Amino acid sequence: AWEKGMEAARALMDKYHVDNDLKANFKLLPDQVEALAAVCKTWLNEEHRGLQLTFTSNKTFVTMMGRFLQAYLQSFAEVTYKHHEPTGCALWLHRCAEIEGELKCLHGSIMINKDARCCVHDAACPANQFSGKSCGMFFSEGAKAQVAFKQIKAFMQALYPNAQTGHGHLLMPLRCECNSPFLGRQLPKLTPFALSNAEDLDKSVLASVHHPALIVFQCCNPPNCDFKISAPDLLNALVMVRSLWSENFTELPRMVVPEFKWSTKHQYRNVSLPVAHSDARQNPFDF
Amino acid sequence: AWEKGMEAARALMDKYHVDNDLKANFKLLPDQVEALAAVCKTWLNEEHRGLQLTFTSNKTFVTMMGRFLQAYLQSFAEVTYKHHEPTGCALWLHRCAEIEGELKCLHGSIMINDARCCVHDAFSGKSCGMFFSEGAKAQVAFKQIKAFMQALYPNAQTGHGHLLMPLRCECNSPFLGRQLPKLTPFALSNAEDLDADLISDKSVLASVHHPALIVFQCCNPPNCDFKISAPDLLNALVMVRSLWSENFTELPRMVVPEFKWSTKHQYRNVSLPVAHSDARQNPFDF
Ligand SMILES: [Zn+2]
Ligand SMILES: [Zn+2]
Numbered sequence: 030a031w032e033k034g035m036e037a038a039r040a041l042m043d044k045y046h047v048d049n050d051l052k053a054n055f056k057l058l059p060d061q062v063e064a065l066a067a068v069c070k071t072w073l074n075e076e077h078r079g080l081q082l083t084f085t086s087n088k089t090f091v092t093m094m095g096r097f098l099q100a101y102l103q104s105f106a107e108v109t110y111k112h113h114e115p116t117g118c119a120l121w122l123h124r125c126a127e128i129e130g131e132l133k134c135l136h137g138s139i140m141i142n143k144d145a146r147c148c149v150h151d152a153a154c155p156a157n158q159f160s161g162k163s164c165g166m167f168f169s170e171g172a173k174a175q176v177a178f179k180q181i182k183a184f185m186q187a188l189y190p191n192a193q194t195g196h197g198h199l200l201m202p203l204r205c206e207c208n209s210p211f212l213g214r215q216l217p218k219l220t221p222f223a224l225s226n227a228e229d230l231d232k233s234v235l236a237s238v239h240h241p242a243l244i245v246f247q248c249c250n251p252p253n254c255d256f257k258i259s260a261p262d263l264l265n266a267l268v269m270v271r272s273l274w275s276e277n278f279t280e281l282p283r284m285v286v287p288e289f290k291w292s293t294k295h296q297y298r299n300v301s302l303p304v305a306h307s308d309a310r311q312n313p314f315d316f
Numbered sequence: 317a318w319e320k321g322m323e324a325a326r327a328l329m330d331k332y333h334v335d336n337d338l339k340a341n342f343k344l345l346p347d348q349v350e351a352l353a354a355v356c357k358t359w360l361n362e363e364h365r366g367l368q369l370t371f372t373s374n375k376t377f378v379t380m381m382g383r384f385l386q387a388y389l390q391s392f393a394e395v396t397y398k399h400h401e402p403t404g405c406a407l408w409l410h411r412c413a414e415i416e417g418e419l420k421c422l423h424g425s426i427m428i429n430d431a432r433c434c435v436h437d438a439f440s441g442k443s444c445g446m447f448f449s450e451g452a453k454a455q456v457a458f459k460q461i462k463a464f465m466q467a468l469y470p471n472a473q474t475g476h477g478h479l480l481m482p483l484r485c486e487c488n489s490p491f492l493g494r495q496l497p498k499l500t501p502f503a504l505s506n507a508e509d510l511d512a513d514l515i516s517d518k519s520v521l522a523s524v525h526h527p528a529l530i531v532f533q534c535c536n537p538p539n540c541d542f543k544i545s546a547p548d549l550l551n552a553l554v555m556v557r558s559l560w561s562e563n564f565t566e567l568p569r570m571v572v573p574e575f576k577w578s579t580k581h582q583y584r585n586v587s588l589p590v591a592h593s594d595a596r597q598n599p600f601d602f
C-alpha cells in the first residue's frame with residue numbers, strides 16, 4: 030500500500046540524509062523524483078566515489094537511478110498510477126546483432142540503406158530527413174551501429190552468463206528530460222560512439238574491446254536537453270539501484286520494465302499545433 | 317502628428333537595423349510596410365527564434381505584423397488617411413460555432429447543401445464566395461478558433477464569437493472572383509488521437525479538442541501565396557503589441573473594423589473595361 034511504500038521511502042531518505050523539506054513533502058506521486066534521485070546521489074558519493082562513466086553525465090546517472098528506485102519503491106507498495114511508467118524506459122528486443130550487416134529500426138522492420146541506414150518510412154525523405162510516419166532512426170555508418178549493438182549484448186552476457194532470456198533485449202529510456210508536445214523525434218536519440226583506445230589496449234571490459242562502439246542515448250532532438258547516458262551505464266544504474274535496495278531490505282520486489290511495442294505515439298512529428306502568445310489585455314480587440 | 321510617429325518609427329527602424337534604403341524611403345504613407353515587416357522579421361529572429369507556425373507562410377506572418385505595427389504607429393501619431401485601413405483585417409462575428417451543426421456565410425445566411433454553400437449557390441454574382449465541401453470538417457475549425465481565443469482571453473468580456481480575418485492579400489493591396497481571402501478548413505492530423513489531459517496549456521487543448529484550423533489564403537488561389545492560419549493571425553497582432561509595449565510601455569488605440577455585409581464583397585462575374593494608355597492627344601485622324 031501507499032503507506033507501506035511510504036515507510037520504505039522514509040527510511041532511505043533518513044539514512045542518506047535527504048533535505049528536511051523534500052522528505053517532508055515527498056508523498057509518493059509520479060512527479061516526485063528529486064528526493065529519490067537525492068538518496069542515490071549521496072549513496073553514490075558515499076559508497077561509490079570511484080564510478081567512472083562512459084559517454085554519460087553525472088546528472089543523467091543520478092537521474093536514472095531515481096527512476097528505477099521509484100519503480101522498486103512502487104513495486105514494493107503494489108501501487109500503479111495511471112498514465113505513468115516509473116522507469117521512463119522500455120525493453121527493445123532489437124535484432125541488430127543477429128544477421129551480419131543487417132539492422133532493424135524501432136518498427137521491427139529492416140532499415141533501408143541510403144551504408145547509411147534509414148527507417149523504411151523515410152523512403153521519399155532525402156537520407157537523414159524524416160517523415161511523419163518515421164520512428165526517427167538513422168545511422169550514417171551502419172556497421173558501427175551494429176558493433177555498438179554487439180557490444181551491449183556482449184556486456185549483457187558477461188554480466189548474466191546463465192540467463193534464460195534477456196541478451197536480445199535492450200534497456201533504453203523512452204523519455205529525456207524534455208518529455209518527462211514538440212516536433213521532431215519523440216524518444217531519446219540512440220547514437221553509436223566509438224572507443225578508439227579500446228582498439229588496442231574481466232569479461233565485461235573485453236566487451237568494449239571486441240566491439241569498440243557504444244550505444245549512447247541523448248535528448249529526443251539535441252526543446253532539447255543535456256540528457257546523455259550510454260546503454261551499459263544505464264544497465265549499471267538498474268543494477269546499482271538493486272544493490273542499494275538489497276543493502277536496506279531482505280527481499281527485492283519484482284520490477285517489470287515494459288517491453289517495447291511500436292506505436293504511432295512515437296512517430297516523428299512534422300506539423301505543429303498553435304500555442305498562444307501572451308497578452309496582458311482582458312478583452313481581445315478594441316470596439 | 318506626423319513628426320511624432322515618424323520619429324517613433326525611425327527609432328524602431330534604427331534599433332532593428334533595417335536597410336538604410338528603406339529607412340530613407342519610408343514616410344508613414346498608406347502602403348509603406350516593407351520597412352516595418354523588416355523591423356518585425358529581425359525582432360522575431362532576435363528575441364523569438366522559437367516561434368512555430370501552423371500552416372502559415374513565414375512571409376505572410378511578418379507582413380501581418382508589419383500591418384499591425386503600421387496601425388499602431390499611425391494611431392500613435394494620429395495620422396489618418398481617406399481610404400486606408402492599416403490592419404487590412406476585419407472582425408467577422410461568425411455564428412458558425414454557436415448552434416451545433418450550423419455554419420453561416422458572410423451574408424449572415426445559414427449555408428445549405430455533405431457540402432455546404434452560400435444560399436445564392438443552391439458562384440453567382442450575388443454570392444460571397446464561401447463554400448465548404450464538408451460541414452463538420454468546417455465547423456470543427458470554427459470551434460477551435462473560438463477555443464483558442466477564450467484561452468488567450470479568459471476574462472474577455474466580449475470577442476469570442478468574432479474572428480480576426482484579413483480582407484486583402486498581396487493582390488488587392490477591381491478584379492474578378494472572390495473579393496477577399498479564401499477561408500479553407502484544414503484538419504489537424506496528429507491532434508486527432510492525443511490525450512486531452514496532457515498539460516495545462518489550454519490553447520493547445522483547443523487544437524486538441526478540435527483538430528482542424530481555419531487557414532486564410534489568396535482571394536482566388538492574378539493570385540498570390542497569401543497563407544495564414546486563424547491562430548497565427550491572432551498571434552501576429554498579439555506579438556506586435558508585445559514589440560510595441562516594450563519600446564513605448566503604454567499601447568495606443570487601434571480598432572480593427574467590424575464586418576458589415578455589402579455588395580463590394582459579392583462574387584464578381586463580369587469585368588469593367590479599362591482603357592489602354594495611348595500617347596496621342598486626339599483619338600482619330602480625319
Ligand atoms: Zn522505423
Ligand atoms: Zn531532451
Ligand SMILES: [Zn+2]
Binds near residue numbers: 421423434444
Ligand atoms: Zn454568402
Ligand SMILES: [Zn+2]
Binds near residue numbers: 485487488536541
Ligand atoms: Zn492574392
